[PDB]
Design a protein around this ligand. Structure first.
Ligand SMILES: CC(C)=CCNc1ncnc2[nH]cnc12
Ligand SMILES: CC(C)=CCNc1ncnc2[nH]cnc12
Lengths: 266, 262
């Protein structure tokens, strides 16, 4: 009841919320950094090395053993850029046809595709799917290759699990990429895309649910890239309407903006 | 009186933040070194034939140097028992050398010659890492425990910078589940090591920070409470603050101490 006890109640909410936001941001940063390393791994060991040291079995083993390096990711995979002129060749060599993600059916003719050729076993269902056949993934692929940096999607429901999450995509370039490249040069030099699924729904719940005081607090995360159209990234709910705190979150993609809001159940 | 209280609060805040930064950067480096140990296992031992070589290791480690902020370099030393030495040297077209003089190694029961190296530590190639006592002890404890280990602070090769070495064991696929120490030794393939150059890279980390001229910072290895060893700072023997550090090796203990000059 007391006004003095209310000041401390807010102080505790601020502290709890700020700590959770720091944990989320730090663990995502750690995961992005290890995805960057995987992109370098594919470049060095698959493309640069003659012959390639990476087959599906090798990729699966390495990513399984390093899963702890990528705490907020449910799986990683590598999609190769295939232009239509090359598609029949690519399919004959791999002995499978490029499929659409919505039904796993053979892809119709498209100018280019991004079929998954290597996958962590946790996302084995991605193998042979054209990652340009989902709009969130397609937009991510384009912005990754044009900018040279890790990029994030808006929140959407992921394949197979239908869990609400975001996808992280990094470009992989050919050795022909010029120094100080233009966007056009980046596109021309694109080899493929290293993608990771941030399963926010399952993995952020797991992270938050183990923390002391979790039952006292309601935590929501929003994508606020468009101020007038906030999108739920994490969270549902009967909460305390009188008091809230907003904690800062920076997931590292300047194209996107996010925030965390905590309230008491009370 | 009020100003003395504020002075204490600033000291605690300054010291705690530096400790956090140092612990976090150490942690990130340790984790990325662990990934490299896994990479050598997967590519050099699990694949047959081996699908990693010096060229590839040098490229990958150069390109990922940013992932390992406090490390001057990383290298992989392979376990070689004496009966295998002749075959090993013929395969590599070099002789196993001592760390102190680069002379051909006398006969030893076993050796840990560096076979892969980041170019920043290229001078380690062919050196027997068991011919230096800090590295030797680290190698033994790494392989017997199955986990990352740290040395005491000591002066590193070439640069003479005061630092600590981080060593991870790499095992053969014959390693049993829930292995004994004896099983770990038998299954050892080699050792992935990284040099934490404290004298240079921690100075770079902490030295640039605002407020640095107002305080004295030390990091101590306090594994032996009665014989603390300087890891960072000067050799000097009221108002101090101790901030916690955990560098991840249960065998070792560390602390940061900060004081005002006046
Ligand atoms: C480029 C690449 C391999 C992206 C990874 N994308 C995805 N990874 C895993 N699940 C998903 N569901 C929808 N998109 C998903
Ligand atoms: C096992 C392994 C390769 C250890 C790395 N050890 C070291 N690495 C870099 N420089 C050093 N100077 C002395 N020991 C050093």
């Amino acid at each position: 009841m007391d006004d003095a006890n209310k000041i401390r109640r807010e102080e505790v909410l601020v502290s709890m919320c700020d700590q959770r936001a720091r944990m989320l941001q730090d663990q995502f940063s750690v995961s992005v950094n290890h995805v960057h390393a995987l992109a370098i791994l594919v470049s060095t060991f698959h493309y640069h090395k003659n012959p390639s040291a990476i087959d599906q079995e090798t990729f699966a083993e390495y990513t399984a053993r390093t899963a702890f390096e990528r705490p907020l990711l449910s799986g990683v995979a590598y999609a190769e850029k295939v232009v239509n002129f090359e598609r029949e060749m690519f399919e004959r060599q791999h002995n499978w046809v490029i499929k659409t993600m919505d039904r796993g059916e053979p892809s119709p003719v498209r100018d280019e595709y991004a079929p998954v050729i290597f996958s962590q076993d946790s996302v084995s269902y991605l193998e042979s799917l054209d990652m340009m056949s989902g709009e969130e993934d397609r937009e991510n692929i384009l912005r990754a290759r044009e900018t040279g940096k890790a990029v994030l999607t808006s929140p959407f429901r992921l394949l197979e699990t239908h869990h609400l999450g975001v996808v992280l995509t990094f470009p992989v370039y050919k050795s022909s990429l010029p120094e100080n490249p233009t966007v056009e040069e980046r596109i021309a030099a694109t080899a493929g895309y290293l993608g990771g699924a941030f399963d926010v729904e399952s993995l952020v719940e797991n992270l938050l649910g183990q923390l002391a005081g979790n039952q006292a607090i309601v935590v929501h995360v929003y994508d606020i890239t468009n101020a007038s159209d906030p999108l739920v990234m994490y969270g549902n709910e009967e909460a305390d309407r009188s008091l809230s705190h907003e904690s800062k979150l920076d997931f590292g993609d300047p194209f996107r903006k996010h925030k965390m809001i905590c309230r008491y159940h009370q």
